[PDB]
Amino acid sequence: SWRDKSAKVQVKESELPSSIPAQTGLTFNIWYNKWSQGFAGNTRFVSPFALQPQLHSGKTRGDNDGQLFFCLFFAKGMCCLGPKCEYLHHIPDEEDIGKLALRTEVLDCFGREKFADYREDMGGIGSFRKKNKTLYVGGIDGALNSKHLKPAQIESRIRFVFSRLGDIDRIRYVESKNCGFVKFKYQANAEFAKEAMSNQTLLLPSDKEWDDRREGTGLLVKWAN
């Protein structure tokens, strides 16, 4: 269990761009976009950083301070703080989901304002965004490095990878569209998995293609419409 462990340092401060910002505001986006734009090319880069749920998860300062929000850097495999982090470094489970559902309505599992293209009538947040638990997952073939897997094996692969970030409700893979849909049982996991799987490979250390995973293209993960 993560509860008996201290969160591991994922990266050294020096492996990251200078001026590491807070995770809650739009400065994170500016910072992350600048980093994202340093990867040359028209196509989505495969991130050099990845969350390893079993290896990385553990207690942080947040667990002692009664923090409810998870670390955005942790989700992306980009946290240098480890046990020093004020935010949670584990996969959101029932306890966390329960706590979050009582504390806030307007903020996601990372403590960022939930964004919708529209607001409700006086005037919370967009109703569809509010209840959405389903992620659009695009560019599957690129994230596998064009590894030849059958549609059913691709479903199994997506299920296996996303299942490590929360309980799965439903998986659909559409071959003709090179895309899938991952519905989580809980929104918090969908929010977490969205940030965790952006620009990620679908390959596993068990594949012979694993070492060449950055030759492919990173996953596109968005909310489904």
Q: Which of 56, 62, 69, 71 binds Zn ion (CB under 5 A)?
A: 71
Q: From Na ion, Zn ion, none, which one binds at residue 69 (CB under 5 to 8 Å depending on kind)?
A: none
| DSSP structure string for 67-106 | --SBPHHHHTT--S-GGG-SSBBS---HHHHHHHHHH-SS
Cβ neighbors of 148 (< 8 A, separation 6 or more) are: none
Rounded distance, CA 125 to CA 83, Å?
A: 34
One of 2, 69, 74, 192 touching Zn ion (CB under 5 A): 74
E strand spans, the chain: 134-138, 168-174, 179-184, 220-223
Instruction: Confirm or reject binding of residue 79 to Zn ion (CB under 5 A).
Output: yes
In the complex, the smallest distance separating the C-beta of residue 108 from Na ion, rounded to whole angstroms, is: 16
Tell me how far, at minimum, the Cβ of 22 lies from Na ion, in Å.
6
Q: Specify the DSSP class assigned to residue 57.
A: -
Cβ of residue 114: shortest distance to Na ion, in angstroms? 17
Stretch that binds Zn ion, among 17-25, 73-81, 105-113, 119-127 (CB under 5 A): 73-81
Phi, psi of 211 (to 5 degrees): -60, -25
The yes or no reply on residue 85 touching Zn ion (CB under 5 A) is: yes
Nearer to Na ion, 90 or 112 (CB): 112
Q: State the residues that interact with Zn ion by CB under 5 A.
A: 71, 73-74, 79, 81, 85
